[PDB]
From TrEMBL, chain B:
Subunit structure comment from the entry: Interacts with capsid protein VP1 and capsid protein VP3 to form heterotrimeric protomers.
Identification of the protein by name: Genome polyprotein
Domain of life: Viruses
Compartments where located: Host cytoplasm; Virion
Range within the parent protein: 79 to 316 of 931
Species assigned in the record: Human enterovirus D68
Residues covered by the Picornavirus capsid domain: 16-208
Family from the record: Belongs to the picornaviruses polyprotein family.
Biological function: Component of immature procapsids, which is cleaved into capsid proteins VP4 and VP2 after maturation. Allows the capsid to remain inactive before the maturation step. Lies on the inner surface of the capsid shell. After binding to the host receptor, the capsid undergoes conformational changes. Capsid protein VP4 is released, Capsid protein VP1 N-terminus is externalized, and together, they shape a pore in the host membrane through which the viral genome is translocated into the host cell cytoplasm.
UniProtKB/TrEMBL annotation, chains D, E:
Segments forming a coiled coil: none
UniProt protein name: Genome polyprotein
Organism of this sequence: Human enterovirus D68 (EV68)
Family: Belongs to the picornaviruses polyprotein family.
Annotated localization: Host cytoplasmic vesicle membrane; Host nucleus; Virion
Job description of the protein: Protein 3CD: Involved in the viral replication complex and viral polypeptide maturation. It exhibits protease activity with a specificity and catalytic efficiency that is different from protease 3C. Protein 3CD lacks polymerase activity. Protein 3CD binds to the 5'UTR of the viral genome. RNA-directed RNA polymerase: Replicates the viral genomic RNA on the surface of intracellular membranes. May form linear arrays of subunits that propagate along a strong head-to-tail interaction called interface-I. Covalently attaches UMP to a tyrosine of VPg, which is used to prime RNA synthesis. The positive stranded RNA genome is first replicated at virus induced membranous vesicles, creating a dsRNA genomic replication form. This dsRNA is then used as template to synthesize positive stranded RNA genomes. ss(+)RNA genomes are either translated, replicated or encapsidated.
Quaternary structure annotation from Swiss-Prot or TrEMBL: Interacts with capsid protein VP1 and capsid protein VP3 in the mature capsid. Interacts with protein 3CD.
UniProtKB/TrEMBL annotation, chain I:
Assembly and oligomerization: Interacts with capsid protein VP1 and capsid protein VP3 in the mature capsid. Interacts with protein 3CD.
Domain of life according to the entry: Viruses
Function: Protein 3CD: Involved in the viral replication complex and viral polypeptide maturation. It exhibits protease activity with a specificity and catalytic efficiency that is different from protease 3C. Protein 3CD lacks polymerase activity. Protein 3CD binds to the 5'UTR of the viral genome. RNA-directed RNA polymerase: Replicates the viral genomic RNA on the surface of intracellular membranes. May form linear arrays of subunits that propagate along a strong head-to-tail interaction called interface-I. Covalently attaches UMP to a tyrosine of VPg, which is used to prime RNA synthesis. The positive stranded RNA genome is first replicated at virus induced membranous vesicles, creating a dsRNA genomic replication form. This dsRNA is then used as template to synthesize positive stranded RNA genomes. ss(+)RNA genomes are either translated, replicated or encapsidated.
UniProt subcellular location: Host cytoplasmic vesicle membrane; Host nucleus; Virion
Residues of the whole record sequence present: 318 to 367 of 2188
Protein name: Genome polyprotein
Family: Belongs to the picornaviruses polyprotein family.
Biological source species: Human enterovirus D68 (EV68)
């Protein structure tokens, strides 16, 4: 329920289930295989 | 091509050879009152060329100490020609104005006039609680002089007056200014003797200067009412 | 439940509000409607009816004598007979009229007024009058040659008893104010004046003095705005028997 | 002929006339008709397209604003020794006691409306300890029902009377009373007598009797006394109105009749309603410059 | 030419110029037109896609926030001996008394708006016992209506005046006043005189007269005195605005006029609006490392 | 009935709220709209108008003397003539301007400024100036060879009286703050300086000293954010006749 | 907004713009012309 | 949300993005070109 | 008007509630979004780092 | 009356048109200069600046 004119007035947006943990776990230019890493 | 201008209205014409375009205030042109905006139901008199013509006021001397000059419309014209007679015989008036301001000097002179048309220029007094009186405001053809042009005599500022319709006369560049004013009022007509729609102001922001031999340098004001309408025919207040 | 919040103005009693409210008598059946003569739906219907001006609002006119103006034969040409103040706000001839009393419940007004005059001399009385409206801006005219320059009707007495002077709505603004400042440029209407155009001429057996009754109404271009309590009524005390309503 | 009118009429331009046998400015007041002279007939006019609305002079808008009809103060205290409104009062419902609403209603002969009622209550300490949040009961007692004799009488159990219970800390209490005349319209004026004998009241139509409003404080008295004031407002709504009347000029004397005296001198004296000017030639506020 | 503008303008990339007869950085101020030189004409630019909104400088947003227009304190007490606002006050409605709203409104010559009015009331005990929950009445008295003379005068019955009744424990009371000028716009400035004689007020358009706000406490006085303060806020809405004006520089002197004195020294002295620096070659906050 | 609950913020008076509210005058008809010249709809239309800078904000310049800069013939090459502080928040030449006064109702600003200079010497006066904008980060330049490295226009006097220096929006952030800390990296704009490019050269019968008028405006890439009470106005007392509004 | 069961509970009816002023201005059996009245 | 009968009761109208700055910046009868002004 | 009644919990400030509320700065335009490296959307992305 | 305001400049000359404003179709070359069939009126020059 939002009757205010500015969209920043609205309630919180709890729906963004997108993740990409590999930008923090695997920032390696060549991806790991399942396999000697080095 | 935008330096030469001829203005013709009724039996009067003005030519200038050193204009700087001309201003149409707020991009408007004068027009007669349409039926969908009319209030008073009597048929108006529209005198056309009898009123819609240039009237030339008394010239003022631009001098080194000059603070500037002002004239209120319609008040400055209320006693002049057939315009004045219709003003005196009618309760209601409406018109635009064509304003032409004239000042020439030699190529060895310098000086700049701000020529500005101020709508509803409600004056203040200086250093008092008492409001300006009737004789402070109603000057007629002679007009007044600025007390404190730097605040426009109204606690405001000259520097920001370019928000109003204006030109400059810069003696280096041009010898005349022209401003066309529409009807500028909250009501569609008014009683001409108790309210002024427009104040013409001429302020010497750069003072007159030369080292040639001095001559009197007058400033001349010519004003044509445009699309004059009058309603409520009566005897003359006069 | 529904999430809500209260705004400013919650719980106020505004006397001009417009809401539904709880019916105290459920299943009540009002009496069937019956046709009655004379339904009014807009108060502008009432001010369009003409009613008598108290033009002779002078000391020594008592009661009904205040609703007539007496005209006599004169021996000087073009004399002033009477004038009528046009302020509806100030206490003049126009106040106690239908247009007057209704308009004083309002603050703004616009549109034309009609004045009608009925000549109540004998059949043998003859004469011509000039009735002049002067738009505002100067003093009320005192000479016929000045008044003649405004809106006027020249009236010949005859078989038709009455003329109307239309007072046209000549105004700078859309409306005028019922302003206690009568000289205000937003309020002043100007003047009505009556002069002899010729003379009242009567034979010996007619009465030498004859009467005008003056009436005013609004025309149907007339409009009223901004409702107010009327200054025509008030009380300083309880009315009699008002207390007895509690006993 | 009936027509829908939302705005004031337009003006057409008019020319010079000079027609024999046509005299639109001449009229005959003796017929009883008002003058039909138009402005286009009297002067040369321009065209004016008129946009002014006429909604504010609708009878519905003119009458349907809330006005005070009853105001009563009484002592909220231990009344065991008093002579008095002993924590309650009865009001015989009328609309004639406050002149602003009375004069507007009396512009009409017949009125049919529903009544929106607003009850505003206020309290002060008698000559401070704070103000108590009292519960009040308003009970409508129609014709022929028994009115309460005491603050605690069993009449207040209200088995079939409409009662509203309301707090002082609430918004004002509000109910609508339906149009309840036994006729199709209230008689604002009544040129008749209430009974079959000759001794009945003049000027009150029995058909318009509403009844009684009885208001008590429901709380038992406190150890200290308060003054309670009740204000009742009525707003007519869903209004029909018939036969407009000349307005009241003289001050009202009474709620029971139209009796009149006038002010001692003008304005609104019996001899002179309008204030005097020096002569019919005197312009009282003449502009002079 | 009129167009819809929601965001600031984009910048296009520009190259080197070197064209004879084309001088976009030269201008003629004497014509009265402002410079039409674009940044792409003055320097070499990159492309910028500009996403900045312009909604916060809308005249509607710039003006339509609630501002204090009236503040009045009075004694709520037994006034039988006082000389004073005896449990009520009258205010002649104006918008010139508080300088923040006044200066914003005076950026324009003509304004047309509806006025949202918020009334905030507060109470303190006079020199403690708690604060009472009073009922107040605000009554709008237009031009030519009678104003109340007393707290209990019959003017307050409000047969046709708009009144709002409100408690101190309520939220602030709120009403909208329609745009009620007899012209199409209010005259913010008025170069004229109010009357047909010469003695009328300069600088006030009679067309803009609103009327009076009369505010009473509805409760009878208590045994002890309180100070009540009323604050009125106006918010313009549905705004049209014409002919922007140079802003006020000097302190206001009066609500009745534009009279001016200035501060004794800069800034906003009559001789010097901007504060002085030592010379035209002095950079006052110059970065030095 | 409807089940409801009240949220936090119920019953508050927020001065920037936006709700409908109860009309005090039912059935009121406002005056018909009329066309008036000069409707403004966005305040960004006003700041795009050029207005005079108070560049000569020095003691011994009185009133109008503060709106002009006087130029004379020099005998040393490439001299500094004047500089302009660019803080709109602090009290400098830019404050009392249309762009200045409107912007001070806001807290954030972005976009380009134009400065125009009109030469008001005689027709016989000649000369070239260089006008330089320096992006922030160091001190204001005092020599032409340093100032020349920023954004500049070389101005020749001639038949066209005026040049514009565009001050391009060169900023790390989307906006700047009107910050009383003038040295803040979120607020400082840098400098404008004027030097002689050649000289002012005049004949004997022209005045030896000539004036510049400087103007500023926003361009149409300009934007304002976060509205605030302007520091340019205040009161410590009731105004005169304010009390008389209650009497 | 009216959730009450009785129609007399409703808000005011401000929509009846019908007028007939001639029942008060012109109750003459033969109507006036634009023309000697008598 | 507006259940009031008079349209002047409504909330503010913040939607008019029409501008014409040239009535204030360029009220010259002959428009400027990109080009000696005089 | 609408008939209503207030429930238990009316007027409470629960710190984990989720409602719209009144915007103090009407017509405000936030700064355009810019791409920044390293957006986190779920804290489970962080605990998966050793 | 009918007038032209003349600014000196690059164009050396102005014309004042004297329009034919007459009650009759013609005027007479009448030695009576004050005759209503002969008099044309006047030309005058003033300083404008
Ligand atoms: C206790 C609650 C549940 O019930 C209540 C019931 C009634 C009231 C109350 O005070 N009602 C009223 C007060 C004053 C006048 C009236 C009239 C009326 C009088 N005269 N007329 C015709 C006219 F106008 F033409 F004269 C109409 C009709 C119905 N009610 C009235 C208060 C509360
Ligand atoms: C009692 C209740 C039911 O009714 C009330 C009615 C009114 C008020 C109240 O305080 N109203 C107001 C206070 C202050 C100013 C105004 C203006 C206004 C003044 N000037 N202007 C033109 C401008 F801006 F250009 F100068 C517009 C117009 C209408 N109202 C105003 C309070 C309550």
């Amino acid at each position: 329920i939002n009757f205010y004119k500015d969209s920043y007035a609205a309630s919180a947006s709890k729906q963004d289930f997108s993740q990409d943990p590999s930008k923090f776990t695997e920032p390696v230019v060549e991806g790991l295989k399942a396999a000697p890493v080095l | 091509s935008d330096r030469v201008l001829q203005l013709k209205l009724g039996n009067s014409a003005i030519v200038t050879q050193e204009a700087a375009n001309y201003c149409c205030a707020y991009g408007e042109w004068p027009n007669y009152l349409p039926d969908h905006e009319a209030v008073a139901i009597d048929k108006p008199t529209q005198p056309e060329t009898a009123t819609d013509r240039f009237y030339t006021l008394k010239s003022v001397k631009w001098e080194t100490g000059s603070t500037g000059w002002w004239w209120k419309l319609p008040d400055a014209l209320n006693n002049i020609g057939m315009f004045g007679q219709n003003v005196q015989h009618h309760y209601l008036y409406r018109s635009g104005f064509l304003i032409h301001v004239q000042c020439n000097a030699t190529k060895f002179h310098q000086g700049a006039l701000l020529v500005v048309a101020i709508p509803e220029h409600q004056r203040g007094a200086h250093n008092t609680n008492t409001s300006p009186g009737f004789d402070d405001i109603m000057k007629g053809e002679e007009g007044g002089t600025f007390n404190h042009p730097y605040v426009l005599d109204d606690g405001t500022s000259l520097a920001c007056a370019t928000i109003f319709p204006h030109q400059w006369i810069n003696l280096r560049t041009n010898n005349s200014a022209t401003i066309v004013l529409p009807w500028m009022n909250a009501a569609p007509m008014d009683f001409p003797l108790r309210h002024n729609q427009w104040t013409l102001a001429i302020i010497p922001v750069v003072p007159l200067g030369t080292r040639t031999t001095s001559s009197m340098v007058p400033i001349t004001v010519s004003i044509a009412p445009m699309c004059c309408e009058f309603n409520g025919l009566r005897h003359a207040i006069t | 439940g529904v999430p809500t919040y209260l705004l400013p103005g919650s719980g106020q009693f505004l006397t001009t509000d417009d809401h539904s409210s709880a019916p105290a008598l459920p299943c009540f059946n009002p009496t069937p409607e019956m046709h009655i003569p004379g339904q009014v739906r807009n108060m502008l219907e009432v001010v369009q009816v003409e009613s008598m001006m108290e033009i002779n609002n002078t000391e020594s006119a008592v009661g009904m004598e205040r609703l007539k103006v007496d005209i006599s034969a004169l021996t000087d040409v073009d004399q002033l007979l009477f004038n009528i103040p046009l302020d509806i706000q100030l206490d003049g001839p126009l106040r106690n009229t239908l247009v007057g009393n209704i308009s004083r419940y309002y603050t703004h007004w616009s549109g034309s007024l009609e004045m009608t005059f009925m000549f109540c001399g004998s059949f043998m009385a003859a004469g011509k009058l000039i009735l002049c409206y002067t738009p505002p801006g100067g003093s009320c005219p005192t000479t016929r040659e000045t008044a003649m320059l405004g809106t006027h009707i020249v009236w010949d007495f005859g078989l038709q008893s009455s003329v109307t002077l239309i007072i046209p709505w000549i105004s700078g603004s859309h409306y005028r104010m019922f302003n206690n400042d009568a000289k205000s440029t937003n309020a002043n209407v100007g003047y009505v004046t009556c002069f002899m155009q010729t003379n009242l001429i009567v034979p010996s057996e007619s009465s030498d003095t004859c009467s005008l009754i003056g009436f005013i109404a609004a025309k149907d271009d007339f409009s009223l705005r901004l409702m107010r309590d009327s200054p025509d009524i008030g009380q300083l005390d309880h009315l009699h028997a008002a207390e007895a309503a509690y006993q | 002929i009936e027509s829908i009118i939302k705005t004031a009429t337009d003006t057409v331009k008019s020319e010079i006339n000079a027609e024999l046998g046509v005299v639109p400015s001449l009229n005959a007041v003796e017929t009883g008709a008002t003058s039909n002279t138009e402005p286009e007939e009297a002067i040369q006019t321009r065209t004016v397209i008129n946009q002014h609305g006429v909604s504010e002079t609708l009878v519905e808008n003119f009458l349907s604003r809330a006005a005070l009809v009853s105001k009563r103060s009484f002592e909220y205290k231990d009344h065991t020794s008093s002579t008095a409104d002993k924590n309650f009062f009865k009001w015989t419902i009328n609309t004639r006691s406050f002149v602003q609403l009375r004069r507007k209603l009396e512009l009409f002969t017949y009125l049919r409306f529903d009544a929106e009622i607003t009850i505003l209550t206020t309290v002060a300490v008698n000559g401070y300890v704070g103000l108590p949040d009292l519960t009040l009961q308003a009970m409508f007692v129609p014709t022929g029902a028994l009115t309460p004799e005491k603050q605690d009488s069993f009449h207040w159990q209200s088995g079939s009377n409409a009662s509203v219970f309301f707090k002082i800390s609430d918004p004002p209490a509000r109910i609508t009373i339906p149009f309840m005349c036994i006729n199709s319209a209230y008689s604002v004026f009544y040129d008749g007598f209430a009974g079959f004998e000759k001794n009945g009241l003049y000027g009150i139509n029995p058909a318009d009797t509403i009844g009684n409003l009885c208001v008590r404080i429901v709380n038992e008295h406190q150890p200290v006394g308060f003054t309670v004031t009740v204000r009742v407002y009525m707003k007519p709504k869903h209004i029909k109105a018939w036969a407009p009347r000349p307005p009241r000029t003289l001050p009202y004397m009474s709620i029971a009749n139209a009796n009149y005296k006038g002010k001692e001198r003008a304005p609104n004296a019996l001899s002179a309603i309008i204030g005097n000017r020096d002569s019919v030639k005197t312009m009282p506020h003449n502009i002079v410059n």
